Amino acid sequence: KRNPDAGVATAVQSVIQHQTFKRMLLFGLRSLADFCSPSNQLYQENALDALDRGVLSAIQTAVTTFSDDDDLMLCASRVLWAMSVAIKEEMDPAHIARVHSEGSPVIVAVVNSSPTDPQTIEDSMNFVDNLKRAGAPVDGASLAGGMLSIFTKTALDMKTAKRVTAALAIAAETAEGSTALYNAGGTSVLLTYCLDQGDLSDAGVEMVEGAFDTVRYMAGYQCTDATTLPQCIALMDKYRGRKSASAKGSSALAAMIGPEQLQKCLNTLKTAEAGSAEYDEALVTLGSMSYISSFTDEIVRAGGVPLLIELINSGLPQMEGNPEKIASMISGAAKMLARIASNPVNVDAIVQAGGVATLCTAVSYCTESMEALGALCMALVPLASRESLAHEIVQYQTFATVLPILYQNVESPEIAALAMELVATGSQHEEIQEHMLQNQAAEICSLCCQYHTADASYQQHAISALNRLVPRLTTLHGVSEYGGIQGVIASLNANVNNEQVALLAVQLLDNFSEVSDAKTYMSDGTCVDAVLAAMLEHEGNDLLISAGVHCLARIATEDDCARHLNVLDTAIQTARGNPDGVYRVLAAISGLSRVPSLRQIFEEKNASDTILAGISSWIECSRFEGQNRIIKAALKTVKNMKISGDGDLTSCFAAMCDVACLPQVKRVVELEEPDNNILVADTAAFRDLAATMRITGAENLERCIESVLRVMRKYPDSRRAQLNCLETLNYLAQCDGGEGVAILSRTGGLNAVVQYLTRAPMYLDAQIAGFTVLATSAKIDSNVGETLRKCNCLQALKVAMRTHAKSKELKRTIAPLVALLMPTDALETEIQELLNECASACEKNNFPHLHENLAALNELLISSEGAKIAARLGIGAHMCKYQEYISAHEQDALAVTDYDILGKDLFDATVSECAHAMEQVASTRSGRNALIKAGNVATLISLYESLKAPQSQYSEEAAIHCLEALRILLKSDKRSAELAFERNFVSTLCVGIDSFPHSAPVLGATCACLAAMATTPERVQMLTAQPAFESLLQKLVFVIQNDPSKDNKLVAMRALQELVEITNDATMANKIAEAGAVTALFRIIDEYGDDEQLTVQAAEVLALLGAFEDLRRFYDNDVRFPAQVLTAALTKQKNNETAVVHLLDVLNKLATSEDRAVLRELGVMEQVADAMRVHSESEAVTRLGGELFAKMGADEQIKSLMLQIIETVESGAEDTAQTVDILCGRLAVFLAAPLEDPRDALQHTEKCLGSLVATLQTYPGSERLEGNVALVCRRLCDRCFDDADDPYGAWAVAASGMLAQFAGMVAGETVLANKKFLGPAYRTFTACCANAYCMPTMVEVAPSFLPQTYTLLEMHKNDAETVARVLEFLRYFAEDPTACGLIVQNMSGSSGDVVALTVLLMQQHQNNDAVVCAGMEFLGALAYTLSQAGYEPLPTLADGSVLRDCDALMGSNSSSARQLAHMHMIEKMLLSKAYNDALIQEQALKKLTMSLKAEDDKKRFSDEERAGLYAAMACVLLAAGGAGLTGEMEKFNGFEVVLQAIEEFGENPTVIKEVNRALQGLSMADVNMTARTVKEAVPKLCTEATTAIQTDAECADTFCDLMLQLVSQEGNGRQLLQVYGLEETLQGVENLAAYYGEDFGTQLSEKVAMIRQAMEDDQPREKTCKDVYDLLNSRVQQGLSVAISEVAILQEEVEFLVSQMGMYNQEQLDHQTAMGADHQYGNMAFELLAATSANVKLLQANEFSKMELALIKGQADPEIVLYAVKALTAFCKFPPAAQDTARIQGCPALVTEACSKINKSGLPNERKEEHLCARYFLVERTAINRNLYNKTPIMTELINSWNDYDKGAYTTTLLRFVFRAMRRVVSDAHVEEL
Amino acid sequence: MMDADVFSILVGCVEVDANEVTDLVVGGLRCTRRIVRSEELAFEYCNAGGIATIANVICKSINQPMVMLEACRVLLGLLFYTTRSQADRQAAVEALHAQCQQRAEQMVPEPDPDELANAAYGGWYQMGMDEV
């Protein structure tokens, strides 16, 4: 337990002691609330304390007697909600009981108080939600009603309302709940609110959705009044725009009006009675019936024509007759018509009754009835969608009529929106575009923007139209003469809140600026200022600012800058008053400074300073209104200026930290909310300044680390500020080569971060950002960990993972957990202990003890190491037992009374902890291996099957863990999935999701398990044949179709996505299609096209199905509906890139080239075109955009456009530049398309280009044209980037003079701003570099523009696309030697060396793979070609500087792409052989393999992705081979990645060809690598990768190369012959040679023949122990290791020697027999490898001691025992070795007798001396204890030897040896002899 | 000691977990009491986050008598050096109102709310202590 704040007690006593007397009760309760808030890190504990102290009786009496006090309600709600949170986590049933019984009544009393305050509602709502989760829900009915009353009160925040209406809806699902609502005010209450106080915000729509869901359910218990239908309809007309609401209204009506009523009305209308009677009545009824979309069809069956009848004949003539009456009828009809234009089939009906004419003519009459005209306008929009129909409509001049009317009648709100809607859907058609433009054009629509500025729809329509029209404008006159610019500025100015319309407004201001006579009308400043202001209000909106800088770049003048800058200080001095004045100047400065040409003025006057000083003057002063605002602005103004500028920032950074630490900051922020105040704005700003990495200088840096620490010291309680600070530390830490860590060390910053994390454990945001800062530094400096352990970072790490079942966190807290990692031996210790304790509790039937200890053990497996250890310690086998015990000891668990968890809870909890353990272990490849091998997939299936009966508290918790451990295992081994695939298990799994029908994790993991086993077509057929699975499909579709929860629908869809995506089988797709998914999913996109999450998720699933299914089938082979729907989503979703991607994907699968007419008619191509333009930089949009346009006949269109370009150039028209520009636009989209016959489609490319280069030369400085020509050239080049024989690509560009043209333009510095040119221009240059025949010309023209290329990178340093394009160019260009010289000797300046500039840009865009990948690839390419062309190594790569910066640019969550680039960079440095010292120092090879092993563990990437990493890594290792860096590898077992590549990717040939090549290169390099290749790798190739080697040409050839290398050395041939599988592969290669024939096959056959000959011919002589000695001895004297674990050649050497010796050792040898002389070398051999402690274990795993000792006892010849002695002597240099030998019983007596034998011998003195020194050395070594030799005559032999020295027999050396032995064996027992 | 931001240490070192060895480093609150010898010094401690830490110590210390004392000592000190006599303050606010009257006579509104608070309230207010 954690202890509660002590103040809780005092607070509570206050609340209890004063429940009558209110003034203080509130005070106390306000204080309890504050203790009970997430501000405090102990609110849960605080909450429970109050409960146990019985505070709720007091809160209960309080809220009854003082019902009214809104403030008591807020406090009460807060404490209870806090209790709710605690009892949910602390699952104590008693506490859950108490809060149910004693707590819910008060929450209820709060809700029946009818509160409007968001917080009190959120809380009591969140209270209700948590209690349900705890398993003690609050009766919906009780809350219903009180919840309705909330709407009796207005002033209700739409956000809160949206939540309440959702909650009413769930309550209404019961008749009980629905009646409660009827008993209180019925539908009216809600509906009235909706009508009166309802808005059209995305929230408001979600609110009304829930209101309509409420009603629906109420109408199905007849709890509906009679006000409902009229009101519902009123509410639908209010929301008609938004289809999600319209649909939920219709659904509600259908539950209220049965089909019988339809029948009645319709037939009654067939019973004529025309004229009042029941006809004109039923007529009114039909009106209503129309709204019910489910009845639209039946209405069309018998009717649809009556309507036009009632319009034309029955009204047009009599219009002049009876205006008022006629009008009403006309309208009602027209509207119904609009309402029934649902499906394309329905609009079909309409044209069959000539609706277009009738309606078109009606307009001509209803020129005076606004109402009727709008009704017509409304009934036309659906018709005017169609193109064929639109041309009819211009022949009626109806556009030409409605436009002028709108203009004059715009103030009237109905007609405006409805006319505009029509002009809008009209403007989508090129033919009309012109017609309109002619008649008063959009000079009226521009003006019209000035009105209805709050009507998003209206404004949207209008501006979308104007953006379809102003392109085709010659002059800006008129629009000015009318005052339309001034009207769009109005719209913009009035829409600070609608990000959407605000965007469009400036896009249109942007587009106005592209007209020729723009300046003439847009240099008033008015516009300038508007855009500037728009820009600062809408910061976070990328597209808006970019569009604004463009507009400004065009019309802004320094004459505008001074008009602001010359009043700056005056405005700052007068900021207390007129804060709006200075607000403007700030916004101007902020914006105009993103224009590179203009920033200089501000730079010169040092405005940033002037502003920073103002900020200070605005804080350290008497507070004033507008203070916060102007400050927050100024902060941004300063931030932006620096960001668009180029200086170092360290000054400004400090200035900002200084501002944040001004004393008055606290007082200024207390009138604000805690995460939008001048403090967080400042911490945000400076963080952003750090991101730029422009903090350079070890002094300059210290300042910043200090300044940030101060900020966090002054303001402990501003959580957002602390976060922004932590984040900021990170960027700083990795500054100045990453040296920052050192500073942070010295400054004490690290301990700060640790002590924050410890102090605020509850804030994950903080936990992650904090440990992030830690992990970063750890990865940049060693010993950082020391400090961390010394700072108790462990205590933190633990409570982190122990309070966060998350992921990203764990990922971050991993490197620490490997540095701190505890003693690690301790982890091991504890893990073994806990396993034993778990096993004991099973053997002893202590169910509680098992639970307690499993949970303990689960706390140690959160670590990659924990898991890896548990595997080694046999957790798999243990789990089998734990499971067996649990399953068969349930009723034991149930009976337990004396434990924290009791009842089923205990049982389920224990399975849960059991499954969890396995889930966790399976986080690692090791773990999955061990788990699987132990049968643990069955174990899990047994656990899962153990859960049943009353869902317990942990039942779900338990299911989730079982299913997740299963998911991981089945996904990770195909065989293991395929073994599990049994009908019964499928049934278990399906039934599982029924048991937890509302659990999304259960459904997710179940579906993953299912898909993972359906690994082949047959299994899919079998899985789909299971009724339980078909039911599941039917059920998933059901949720998608009916469940009003957005989150449910998403989950049901993600579940389908996974079944079809993993399985990727047509049969799956077909079953899902047949369960109704296709139509359900399309319906999502129809109703929710305005919801990105939904639209995307639906499109993703539609797209997968679409690969297999012809989606028209589900619409009776009419494409129109699915097309219409997708086109409309693409419209609404145009700016969201991932949404257009997936929509375009569906369109491309839906449609065929046989649908052109259809696709013209529904305007699909227009939208695709526009999507491509908006997302020009997107690989996927362009590609899919291309595939769609290929259905329109691209081959022909390219031919056509290309010919038109040529013709218009040769005409010399005045229009020419603009005409060629539009043509290039069009040509560029088609060039995205794949072609049937490129040689025919592209035939005119070169001439066309010639025409275009001429055009540019003629008309310079045409920004649009420059871009489109470049775009054209890019797409041309891209089509064939890699085919150097293609003539239409880089070839055409270079031969046409276009390449030299572009080079010139950059060199002319005239285009260094047209980002729309530079991008594709540099891609074009890239393509010319990549084409080898173009490369000489690139080199020719490059010197002209390379210097400027540097300038661009500095100028557009903040634009990531531009940087990537240019860095990509440098990368491709650096493949040429001469080019490499130019780069390094032409690209320097402020940012510095090109390599420096590259790091600077990478560091700035760490989040952008495109920049970082291009960056790293460049560095490597440059590094290599330089080394090859003589240049000396880049210095800043060689000092490790850049290797580190690159290492820091890898996140824990880094793409496969970035990992690949990083390898490529290192591959190239290794191939350069120039940077080996630096690569070794940074442990580059190690860190790459760590990255990769980590990735094999967590399996974050796909299989295709990891395959590619392994292939790449192989190549790294081959480079390492060629650079002589084997040995660095055998440090960290680098060979192992090659073995792993074969095992996981033996079936993938693009890996294996690399593995083969890498093995060959590694072998040539290193004799040990060779050995491993033979003994370990080739066995694995010939089995696991045999199928690849025999069926893929390159695998076969590479494998034969590898073999040929291996057999070239003596001994290898023989071994390779024994390899199992080799033969099968070799003859399969043979067969692959026969198949290919020609030259390739001949040489392949010959390769295998040579291999076979080399293997037969490999005949090494029998080897002798003497060879073993000669190799070791030579190794030794050249200082090479002789540790077996480190040197692979030695393993075979030591094992021959063990065995050869052992057969020798059974005979009595002679020092003069060949055999016995060889036995000496064998011991000298042993002597040398017993000199390295490393070899001890292995040696003693052959009882080395025993063998040696035996020889000493047995053998007769003194000279063979000598060498056993010398060798064992050396062995016992090491303490454990000694101990062992000594322990061996007999040892002392035995070696002692060896001494005697020699002392008694008649050997010559010189020989006796050598023998005795050896023997006495052995006794010295083996006498580990002075007592060991007690029972022995050693002292006599030593003494005897002494007395022989005395007789002049020996030298002094002996005495020394005797004296050494004596001192080791002297004891009580030898005193006599001495 | 001021020139090298010593207050940065005396603020930090005082916010820690408690424990008998650390209760002693918090006894180093004394160090802070002995250094803060004037008004200017009290304000320097505040500018270093003194007020927020002392508050956080006082509030955690119900069951820590030794540090409760040492920390209340520090705060009483801070208050003392920053709080003026009710009289001087009363005088200050009368004056403020006088100025107000003068301008109006020539040209009656209220003194600036914050200026008025600044003159009338004790050190707690000047040092940025809030009601809660």
Author numbering:
A (entry chain A): 7 to 1880
B (entry chain A): 2193 to 2210, 2213 to 2301, 2324 to 2348
What does the paper say about this structure?
The phylum of Apicomplexa groups intracellular parasites that employ substrate-dependent gliding motility to invade host cells, egress from the infected cells, and cross biological barriers. The glideosome-associated connector (GAC) protein is a central bridging component of the gliding machinery. This large protein composed of numerous armadillo repeats (ARMs) is highly conserved throughout the Apicomplexa phylum and links F-actin to the TRAP/MIC family of surface adhesins at the plasma membrane, which targets host cell ligands and mediates adherent anchor points.
The structure was solved by multiple-wavelength anomalous dispersion (MAD) to 2.7 Å resolution with an Rfree of 26%. The electron density for residues 7–2504 was of sufficient quality to facilitate modelling for these residues. The remaining electron density showed evidence of peptide backbone but could not be confidently modelled and refined, indicating a degree of conformational flexibility for residues 2505–2639. The crystal structure of TgGAC7–2504 comprises 169 helices arranged in 53 consecutive helical bundles that resemble ARM and HEAT-like repeats (AHRs; Kippert and Gerloff, 2009) linked to the mixed α/β C-terminal PH domain. RI (residues 1–1665) comprises 37 consecutive AHRs of approximately 40 residues long that are supercoiled into a three-layer pyramid structure. RII comprises 16 canonical armadillo repeats (AHR38-53) and forms a superhelical arch that contacts the base of the RI pyramid helical regions. This interface encompasses a surface area of 1550 Å2, with AHR1 and AHR17-18 from RI forming one side while AHR48-50 from RII form the other. The interface comprises several prominent electrostatic interactions (K2254-D11, E2436-H24, D2330-R629, D2346-K672, and D2197-R716). Remarkably, the overall architecture of the predicted structures is very similar to that observed in the crystal structure of TgGAC, as it is characterised by a series of tandem AHRs that are supercoiled into a large ring and is closed by specific interactions between N- and C-terminal AHRs.
